[PDB]
Amino acid sequence: MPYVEIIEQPKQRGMRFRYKCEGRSAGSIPGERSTDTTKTHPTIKINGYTGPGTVRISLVTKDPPHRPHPHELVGKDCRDGYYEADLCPDRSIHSFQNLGIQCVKKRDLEQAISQRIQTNNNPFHVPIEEQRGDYDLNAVRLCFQVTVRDPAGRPLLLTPVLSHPIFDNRAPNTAELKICRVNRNSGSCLGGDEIFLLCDKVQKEDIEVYFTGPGWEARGSFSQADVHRQVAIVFRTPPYADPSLQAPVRVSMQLRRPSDRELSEPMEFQYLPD
Amino acid sequence: MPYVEIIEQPKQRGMRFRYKCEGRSAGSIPGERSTDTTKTHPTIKINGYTGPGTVRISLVTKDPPHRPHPHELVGKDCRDGYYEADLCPDRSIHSFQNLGIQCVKKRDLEQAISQRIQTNNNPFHVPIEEQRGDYDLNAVRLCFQVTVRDPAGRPLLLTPVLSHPIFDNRAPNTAELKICRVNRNSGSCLGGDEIFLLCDKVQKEDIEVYFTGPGWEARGSFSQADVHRQVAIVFRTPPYADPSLQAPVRVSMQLRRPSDRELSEPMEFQYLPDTD
DNA sequence: ACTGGGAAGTTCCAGTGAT
DNA sequence: ATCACTGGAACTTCCCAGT
Numbered sequence: 001m002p003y004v005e006i007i008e009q010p011k012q013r014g015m016r017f018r019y020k021c022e023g024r025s026a027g028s029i030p031g032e033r034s035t036d037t038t039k040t041h042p043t044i045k046i047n048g049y050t051g052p053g054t055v056r057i058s059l060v061t062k063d064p065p066h067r068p069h070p071h072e073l074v075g076k077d078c079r080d081g082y083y084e085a086d087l088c089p090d091r092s093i094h095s096f097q098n099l100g101i102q103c104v105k106k107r108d109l110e111q112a113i114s115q116r117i118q119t120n121n122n123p124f125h126v127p128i129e130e131q132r133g134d135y136d137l138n139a140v141r142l143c144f145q146v147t148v149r150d151p152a153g154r155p156l157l158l159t160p161v162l163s164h165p166i167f168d169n170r171a172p173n174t175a176e177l178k179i180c181r182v183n184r185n186s187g188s189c190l191g192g193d194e195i196f197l198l199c200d201k202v203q204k205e206d207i208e209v210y211f212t213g214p215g216w217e218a219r220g221s222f223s224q225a226d227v228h229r230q231v232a233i234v235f236r237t238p239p240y241a242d243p244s245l246q247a248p249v250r251v252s253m254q255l256r257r258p259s260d261r262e263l264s265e266p267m268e269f270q271y272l273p274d
Numbered sequence: 275m276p277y278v279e280i281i282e283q284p285k286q287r288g289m290r291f292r293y294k295c296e297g298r299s300a301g302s303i304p305g306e307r308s309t310d311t312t313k314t315h316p317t318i319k320i321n322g323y324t325g326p327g328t329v330r331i332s333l334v335t336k337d338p339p340h341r342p343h344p345h346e347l348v349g350k351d352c353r354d355g356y357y358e359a360d361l362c363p364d365r366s367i368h369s370f371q372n373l374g375i376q377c378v379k380k381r382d383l384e385q386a387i388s389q390r391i392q393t394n395n396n397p398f399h400v401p402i403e404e405q406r407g408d409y410d411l412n413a414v415r416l417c418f419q420v421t422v423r424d425p426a427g428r429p430l431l432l433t434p435v436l437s438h439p440i441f442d443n444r445a446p447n448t449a450e451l452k453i454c455r456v457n458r459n460s461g462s463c464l465g466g467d468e469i470f471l472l473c474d475k476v477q478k479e480d481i482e483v484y485f486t487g488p489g490w491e492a493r494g495s496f497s498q499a500d501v502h503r504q505v506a507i508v509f510r511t512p513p514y515a516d517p518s519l520q521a522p523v524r525v526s527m528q529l530r531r532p533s534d535r536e537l538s539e540p541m542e543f544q545y546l547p548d549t550d
Numbered sequence: 551a552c553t554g555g556g557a558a559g560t561t562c563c564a565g566t567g568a569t
Numbered sequence: 570a571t572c573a574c575t576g577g578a579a580c581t582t583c584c585c586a587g588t
């Protein structure tokens with residue numbers, strides 16, 4: 001067995017799935033170590049083979065059994081919702097720089113699933129009896145299906161390998177959590193300071209403000225009514241563990257989504273004596 | 275139009291749905307305000323009509339679209355999973371004393387749904403296409419379908435009205451929270467005292483230990499790994515608001531479920547001064 | 551049966567940057 | 570300059586909860 005290794009996973013959060021109405025292609029999935037400057041792409045290594053062959057990339061469901069997803073991969077060398085291209089004969093490391101995710105509408109689900117079946121796009125060969133019930137339209141995995149050749153030219157299908165899931169950034173409960181701005185980043189160790197926090201879209205029933213430091217955690221105090229049009233929160237700081245401070249102590253403040261335990265990048269908060 | 279109002283909702287929690295194999299009544303859904311010395315039952319009022327009429331009561335899903343549920347109502351005047359009988363023509367208020375819920379097995383789900391369709395038990399006329407979503411078999415709603423007569427004296431089906439959800443008491447995500455036994459009920463105002471708490475079944479990813487007083491709240495500290503087989507939690511007390519207590523302070527301690535903000539009954543905990 | 555209102559799902563659009 | 574692409578805004582559907 002030669003086999004396929006993912007050397008660069010896709011970035012999980014931050015990219016929108018795009019509708020067909022928004023255009024032919026849907027951009028390019030970044031690798032998880034992409035940045036403003038040096039941007040990267042999902043990448044695989046084929047161990048134990050070099051030479052001609054085929055790579056197919058398809059979308060499957062986040063959870064097992066990994067059914068073909070109703071959404072589509074679009075971009076260079078994509079057709080019928082999947083990517084397919086000749087493997088580069090020379091190298092054993094392969095990057096995919098033009099993969100976009102095009103989301104199907106909810107009313108077009110049954111048709112999309114019909115197309116997956118008709119195009120033999122079912123990497124795990126899931127029985128049709130299982131392709132009926134609920135799909136998570138906010139998450140997908142890439143499935144890499146590489147075919148290489150034996151010494152006589154016979155195709156050999158390597159075991160399919162799944163990426164980490166990719167989450168729709170436009171969707172209510174799977175978006176990147178991001179603190180955009182706060183009115184202040186320090187306050188008293190007694191707590192009770194009012195913070196106005198501007199954020200990317202949140203759901204008021206599935207959001208908290210989580211303060212953390214060495215062996216300490218607490219929560220900002222607010223009600224659902226204090227979440228203003230999903231993009232601002234007014235809350236009160238918690239008391240720090242120690243209500244009488246020698247000197248300033250720095251802690252982290254982040255948005256937390258309790259449903260999936262996801263966190264924003266931390267913002268520094270400084271607790272002050274008195 | 276006359277219309278139906280629910281004046282006594284079914285009690286949401288406390289009933290175990292029974293399987294056919296258990297071969298018993300399946301019991302009687304009590305009303306929301308029922309108490310031992312004052313039994314009450316699910317009750318409706320018809321506004322704008324006294325006179326002959328019939329009612330059908332069926333089970334539908336908790337969430338829209340309100341599809342017929344695979345489970346069955348069983349009891350007097352129930353057949354094919356629904357209740358149907360006359361309403362008293364001399365009165366506007368009607369109660370139902372013997373409604374029970376029989377749960378269908380997962381392997382029998384498709385047969386049960388076929389039965390709902392075959393017996394025209396689809397109160398919201400949901401297309402068969404949309405009856406393909408997964409079902410929550412631990413929650414149902416009652417659906418009351420009253421047929422009256424118009425002023426001319428022909429059959430008139432009123433708009434169906436849904437109850438609050440009824441939950442199977444087997445499901446921990448919707449169960450009553452209960453503290454059964456705790457090994458200590460006081461500790462230092464500095465926090466950090468280890469407590470063993472035995473409780474009714476919880477889910478380890480969706481439980482907290484919540485300490486409160488006037489204008490104060492804090493949580494016990496523990497990981498998922500500290501919840502033992504859904505029925506025990508080993509946690510450390512949070513510090514009290516005031517680390518310089520000069521005498522004991524009583525606070526409340528309770529289990530809390532973050533998902534629906536449900537609380538157990540409170541217990542008394544005393545924080546104590548710490549000398550050493 | 552309607553009635554006020556928040557937000558999920560879908561579409562449109564203004565600016566625009568790094569090969 | 571282009572022009573797919575980015576992220577903000579607008580449009581359309583759904584749903585809850587009250588008289």
Ligand SMILES: CCCCCCCCO[C@@H]1O[C@H](CO)[C@@H](O)[C@H](O)[C@H]1O
Pocket residue numbers: 277551588
């Ligand atoms: C003087 C008020 C008379 C009643 C107002 C018009 C008829 C009732 O109007 C509405 O009908 C609904 C039924 O669909 C009820 O649930 C509401 O509570 C009621 O206000």
